[PDB]
Amino acid sequence: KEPCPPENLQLPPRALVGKWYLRTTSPDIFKQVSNITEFYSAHGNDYYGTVTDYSPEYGLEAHRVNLTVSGSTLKFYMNDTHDYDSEYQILAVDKDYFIFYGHPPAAPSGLALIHYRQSCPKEDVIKRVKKNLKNVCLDYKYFGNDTSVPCHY
Ligand SMILES: *[C@@H]1O[C@H](CO)[C@@H](O[C@@H]2O[C@H](CO)[C@@H](O[C@@H]3O[C@H](CO)[C@@H](O)[C@H](O)[C@@H]3O)[C@H](O)[C@H]2NC(C)=O)[C@H](O)[C@H]1NC(C)=O
Ligand SMILES: *[C@@H]1O[C@H](CO)[C@@H](O[C@@H]2O[C@H](CO)[C@@H](O[C@@H]3O[C@H](CO)[C@@H](O)[C@H](O)[C@@H]3O)[C@H](O)[C@H]2NC(C)=O)[C@H](O)[C@H]1NC(C)=O
Ligand SMILES: *[C@@H]1O[C@H](CO)[C@@H](O[C@@H]2O[C@H](CO)[C@@H](O)[C@H](O)[C@H]2NC(C)=O)[C@H](O)[C@H]1NC(C)=O
Ligand SMILES: CCCCCCCC/C=C\CCCCCCCC(=O)O
Ligand SMILES: *[C@@H]1O[C@H](CO)[C@@H](O)[C@H](O)[C@H]1NC(C)=O
């Protein structure tokens, strides 16, 4: 489903700096790729860094990424594979998570991505994410988790 982005949502400088875990998406992409870790460093208003993930074909792999930021949108570019390369629009930004949405070749009808500061986000963070999704006309129940990451005994 296409979101209804906030009209005056600002993307503050260096808000994306550091390590993030991509743990929840719509549609569910985690049969295709899992254990996604992002690390971003600031370069002016833009970002550069690395994404590591587990590929069914390649096992644990690493890629260099660039984020080119313009207002509430950014261009995501990966160095050695381009199925996720797209413009992405920020839908929500918080100290504990951020959400954006784009239409990469891997999911051309739309892909919502939720990135967390925590590998296994606590209940209170997920509840905030649920509320943020509703605020941009999305629904958490239509998202899928990375079940390959052990967040429960
Ligand atoms: C899930 O993703 C995490 C994050 O990438 C993986 O943890 C990382 O695993 C690699 C390989 O075991 C570690 O690399 C090692 O780093 C040391 C220091 O740089 C180096 O000397 C070794 O030769 C090796 O390159 C990496 O440190 C480690 N990171 C963390 C934070 O633990 C994990 O393996 C992935 N698991 C699955 C099942 O995909
Ligand atoms: C896309 O970006 C990734 C991540 O930066 C690149 O992976 C890197 O590839 C180089 C080879 O070009 C690897 O160098 C290797 O280092 C190991 C020690 O770790 C050593 O055995 C050799 O000297 C070898 O040359 C480097 O480790 C590797 N980095 C990571 C984090 O995996 C990849 O090459 C880039 N691809 C393209 C097409 O630009
Ligand atoms: C994705 O993971 C979250 C977190 O584990 C799930 O939300 C929890 O679901 C369990 C039962 O599945 C409930 O007991 C918790 O109360 C839920 N937490 C919150 C904050 O609502 C979510 O259901 C998972 N989604 C899918 C599709 O499996
Ligand atoms: C905002 C998007 C950031 C998340 C990107 C998800 C990371 C997934 C990375 C790589 C997925 C695998 C690439 C596609 C597989 C084909 C590669 C090949 O056959 O050589
Ligand atoms: C971003 O991409 C440019 C290519 O235009 C590259 O030279 C640079 O190393 C990347 N990272 C930055 C600018 O932090």
Numbering used by the authors: 1 to 153
Sentences from the paper on this structure:
Complementary DNA analyses revealed 22 distinct but similar peptides encoded by milk genes with homology to the lipocalin family of lipid-binding proteins, which are referred to as lipocalin-like milk proteins or Lili-Mip in this article. The data revealed glycosylated proteins that adopt a lipocalin fold, bind lipids and organize to form a tightly packed crystalline lattice. Lili-Mip serves as a complete nutrient by providing all of the essential amino acids, carbohydrates from the attached glycans, and lipids through chaperoning linoleic and oleic acids. After ingestion by the embryos, its increasing concentration in the midgut facilitates the crystallization of Lili-Mip.
Additionally, several crystals were solubilized and recrystallized in vitro. A third data set was collected from an in vitro-grown Lili-Mip crystal. The in vitro recrystallization of the solubilized Lili-Mip crystals, using only higher molecular-weight polyethylene glycol, demonstrated the high propensity of this protein for crystallization. In all cases, Lili-Mip crystallized in the triclinic P1 lattice, with one molecule per asymmetric unit and unit-cell parameters a = 32.28, b = 33.22, c = 40.18 Å, α = 99.5, β = 100.28, γ = 104.11°. Amino-acid sequence heterogeneity was observed in the structures determined from all three data sets.
